[PDB]
Write an enzyme that holds these catalytic residues in place. Sequence first.
Site, short mmCIF file in Angstrom:
data_model
loop_
_atom_site.label_atom_id
_atom_site.label_comp_id
_atom_site.label_asym_id
_atom_site.label_seq_id
_atom_site.Cartn_x
_atom_site.Cartn_y
_atom_site.Cartn_z
N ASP D 54 0.85 -1.18 0.00
CA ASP D 54 0.00 0.00 0.00
C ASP D 54 0.89 1.24 0.00
O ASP D 54 1.96 1.26 0.61
CB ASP D 54 -0.95 0.01 1.20
CG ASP D 54 -2.16 0.89 0.98
OD1 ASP D 54 -2.28 1.48 -0.12
OD2 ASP D 54 -3.01 0.99 1.89
N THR D 87 -4.34 4.17 -1.53
CA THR D 87 -3.29 5.17 -1.51
C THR D 87 -2.55 5.20 -2.84
O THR D 87 -2.27 6.28 -3.38
CB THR D 87 -2.31 4.88 -0.37
OG1 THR D 87 -1.75 3.57 -0.55
CG2 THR D 87 -3.04 4.92 0.96
N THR D 88 -2.23 4.03 -3.38
CA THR D 88 -1.59 3.97 -4.68
C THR D 88 -2.48 4.53 -5.77
O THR D 88 -1.99 5.07 -6.77
CB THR D 88 -1.21 2.52 -5.01
OG1 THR D 88 -2.33 1.67 -4.74
CG2 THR D 88 -0.03 2.08 -4.16
#
Lengths: 60, 202, 534, 521
Positions: D54, D87-88
């Site tokens: 993540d 998040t990515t």
Amino acid sequence: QKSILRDALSDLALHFLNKMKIMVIKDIEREDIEFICKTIGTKPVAHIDQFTADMLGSAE
Amino acid sequence: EWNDILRKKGILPPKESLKELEEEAEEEQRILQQSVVKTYEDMTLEELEDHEDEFNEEDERAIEMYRRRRLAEWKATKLKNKFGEVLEISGKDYVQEVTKAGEGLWVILHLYKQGIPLCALINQHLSGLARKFPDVKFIKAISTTCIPNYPDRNLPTIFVYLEGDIKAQFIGPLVFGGMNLTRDELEWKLSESGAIMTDLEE
Amino acid sequence: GPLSVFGDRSTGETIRSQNVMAAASIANIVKSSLGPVGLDKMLVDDIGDVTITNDGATILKLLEVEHPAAKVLCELADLQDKEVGDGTTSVVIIAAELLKNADELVKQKIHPTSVISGYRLACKEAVRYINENLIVNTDELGRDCLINAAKTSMSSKIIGINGDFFANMVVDAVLAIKYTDIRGQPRYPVNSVNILKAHGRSQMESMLISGYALNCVVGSQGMPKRIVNAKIACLDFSLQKTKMKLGVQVVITDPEKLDQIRQRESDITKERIQKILATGANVILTTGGIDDMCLKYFVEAGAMAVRRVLKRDLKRIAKASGATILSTLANLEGEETFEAAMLGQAEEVVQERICDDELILIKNTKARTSASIILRGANDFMCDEMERSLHDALCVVKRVLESKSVVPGGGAVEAALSIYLENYATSMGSREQLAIAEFARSLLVIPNTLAVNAAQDSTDLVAKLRAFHNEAQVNPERKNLKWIGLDLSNGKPRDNKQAGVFEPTIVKVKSLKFATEAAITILRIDDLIKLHPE
Amino acid sequence: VLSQNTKRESGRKVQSGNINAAKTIADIIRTCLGPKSMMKMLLDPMGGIVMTNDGNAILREIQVQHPAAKSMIEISRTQDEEVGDGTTSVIILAGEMLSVAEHFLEQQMHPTVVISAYRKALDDMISTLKKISIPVDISDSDMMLNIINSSITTKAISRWSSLACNIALDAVKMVQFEENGRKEIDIKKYARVEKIPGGIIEDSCVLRGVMINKDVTHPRMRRYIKNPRIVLLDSSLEYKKGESQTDIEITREEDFTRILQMEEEYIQQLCEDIIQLKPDVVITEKGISDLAQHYLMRANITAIRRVRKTDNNRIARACGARIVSRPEELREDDVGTGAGLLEIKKIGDEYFTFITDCKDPKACTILLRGASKEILSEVERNLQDAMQVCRNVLLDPQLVPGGGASEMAVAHALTEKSKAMTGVEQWPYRAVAQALEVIPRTLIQNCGASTIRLLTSLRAKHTQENCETWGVNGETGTLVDMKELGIWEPLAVKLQTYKTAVETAVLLLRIDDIVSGHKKK
């Protein structure tokens, strides 16, 4: 007057003056006080027993 | 190409040098990181009072030994706390404390003429210092009875004596001039005399 | 030689030329931060701190600089900022242009006093002209001039896209701050509205507190973290285990009093605690810290106390809440007591979590109403950008409410003054008029630059603007052609007052004053001596 | 003049560096989302060894020279604090859409019209997302487990989801509470995460009580109690050294033994004041002398000391007890009850107090039995994400289909509204709309299967309605309807991702001047 080794102003007395509505200014240099005596005619008070209107001036 | 062939044969150009300096510096930087944990159990003397957040195992051999050394250190340091009030000896005896003042004990030989806020503030600072370091002999007096007709334009002059040898000098207000001078700066100067070990910003 | 050894010397127009050298230099850097539309410049510290800025003075503060004449320019910009905040960027540009122009003037071998007097009188007459003819009325406006001026100010800032929503916000935190500090003239102070960051949700929903908010978190969580009706008591007196003073010592003979004093020292604290609490006070804010036991007594009583208040914060809270700052429990008599004439009253107090952290919200102080803003930033650096933007906007709106008279900002005034002054300097026999006349041409730097920063042909645009100004001043009937400036978005000579490009008049007035003073100061130098370092 | 070591640059090169670094960073973390995810490893500057998939949790572990990458890391931590998942996603969206903006910037464009296009674009697509927003009731546990499994599908610990997912939901309720009957609060700081090395994943679950890594403070105390009586003190039982100094002058024949008698009597009186309201356990963060314990051995108290402050908060919240500072203020209402079960069990080679609650808890503590601190850290981060999304759905009962289909749906909607509008900004508008679907091609790359044909069929299917839910199946690289696959993401998360990427792009596309090497002042 500016004082060393001792606080010329007292925090409790600061609150007292705040209660009694008088401007409080401390840390005044040793010399030009005579200038102040020459300026506004005020005279120093070195003891509360000395204190009298004779060393108190008037301003506008 | 040609440059490195030069390098095998000659040294006429320098370009492979000085690449060991930063290497060694980084090596020492990584090395010096274990000093924080090396003496973790070797500095604090309250770790016994720090139970339940400092205990994992007690070998009772080096750790009781640590208590023993710690208590010896504590008794040695607290057997010397005998001072804390700057004192006014007279000039008649003066020869007896300039010399017979104990060897291995620093003497802050203060001389002054009372009346100027310079000398008054310095006396205040040293008296307050006495509250912190009761292992230092403070001396205050009137220089007139210590030195006959001493020049009154040369006060307050700080004297640092031990075994009759002047180690540090601070003559007149030329090094203390100014009401802005403070507690920690005096302590800093006396530390610089070599008597005290502390830390200050400036 | 001259007996000035161990140093260096210089003279001649050369050094005067070199006096231009640095000055004009510092112009180019800021040459993209002008008025309504500009582009931000990036700064990286030695540590590597990531920072952005859009106004010249703030940019230059974080930057090293030498040739202390450059320090003169730095401090002139600082003066302008401390005086207005907007229009503080153009002063350096116009100063550099004036310096180059006067250097050429003396290159044609004019007495320095001549150009000095010309510049002085030109500045005086131009300030008079600014204060007479080239202002736009905003006193007649209401709730619209505020937004127009805010938009023009923060237009160069990165928020104007939605800054409307912001503008109202900011100004609505202001218009309710109406107090007579001098008892005969109500004045609006700054720092009366706290600006607090939040890097969570988007800026388009920035928060305006109809109350007050401060960075405060309760001591323990067993304590009530919110109350729907609170009594506020503020103390500048810190609470802890009592030490009388070192001037008073304690020594006893019988040891049968250890418990006595070792209880009494805290008996004083807790009896004061009960004196405060029994009076009904629910909110306690002390500038100093408070020890755990007092908070424990609080959670027993169910009242709320927060420590480590900063002094000015406490004073402004007491002002808004109607509370009274107190620094000791002693009263008009030595025997201490407590009163309820200082119970700050507010509707609601809550400890509200924003991103991962909370702070205290004060709603509807039962004495008067204050305000504050919680900005919804994206990353810390654009938060810094926005907070600078809002601070400058606060300064500008303070100026606006201090002087409800506005000059059309952006740079139309530059060409207007150029035309006005060029009309002058032609009715007297003094050669100085030439120097005087030059002042006008210097004013022509600011607007043109914008179009270059806007990638538009500034030449023809300013030619049309100066033609309009020329006909307006030679034809006072067409004087209303001072209601046309330049449009930076499309390169259009158009009514500036129509859009609302606005700035207070004192901006340009003090700009002229400070620029002229610094210009005299720096042109005065035509020599130097050096003293070698230590 | 200007100081020596200050370099100042301008021109195209600064934006070139900006966009190049943006695409670079986006081109280092692309292959980690969807079911097909590929588990990254990295080393901290200290020398530790970590592995995660993540975004921000690992992007915090990079030092960079260029400023734009530091801005990227701040954006990453902003998304981490705000949503805790995907998040990515925001990072790759920002990188791809900046890349799209780059080509357009090369072609005579100026950033003013570009940022205007962003503002109108974000307004339009957020409005469209509001249109396609559907609320679903949050009272179903099966729904919540489905969403937890959907989120963890990107995570490798999905194997144990069958149990693990449920665990998450448990905490979300058994910590849940409201102050004074309002302002519902779910504190993760009250959800302390404790992990015990060793043991299978299944044995790890939330306990209806509080967990602390401590033990008994004296051998001769009972090691098990069904219902102890709970009291919390915040003062030491050892002699308090007062505030001032006295230096008692011993003048008479004897006071020292009298001094010790007075000391032990003070200890006795305070300890008996504590005993007055007969407890069974006394807990305090301060150290305790032997005398207080000895006196308590008459009252058979559990006598536990030196606990953590936030641990005190959590235990008080679970028990519902109050906290006292003086034995004298001890009263009835403070002593909370609810300690349904208490044990001191030796786990592995360490002791742990096992207090099991019988009544309603308002704070949870987690047992995590695993194989290594790094794997336990992984599962801890992922369960933190689980409760994060659980509470997010609790606050907002909205859902839209997962698998990235909504990206293309709103892209088509923006395409139609670009047809509706008139201007030149329609080109960057539609272009960033095309940038939006970088996710599905990334998913296909994770799958490594055919790309263009599925992409085109997907694109054709979503230009009409009735297919918005239908999305991309990353299990086998196929196209299916999401009404049955189960990947469903909350509205606020994608809202925040969209806003974050767009605002980062708006920030990075205004600079013209860089100055380097100045000094702090």
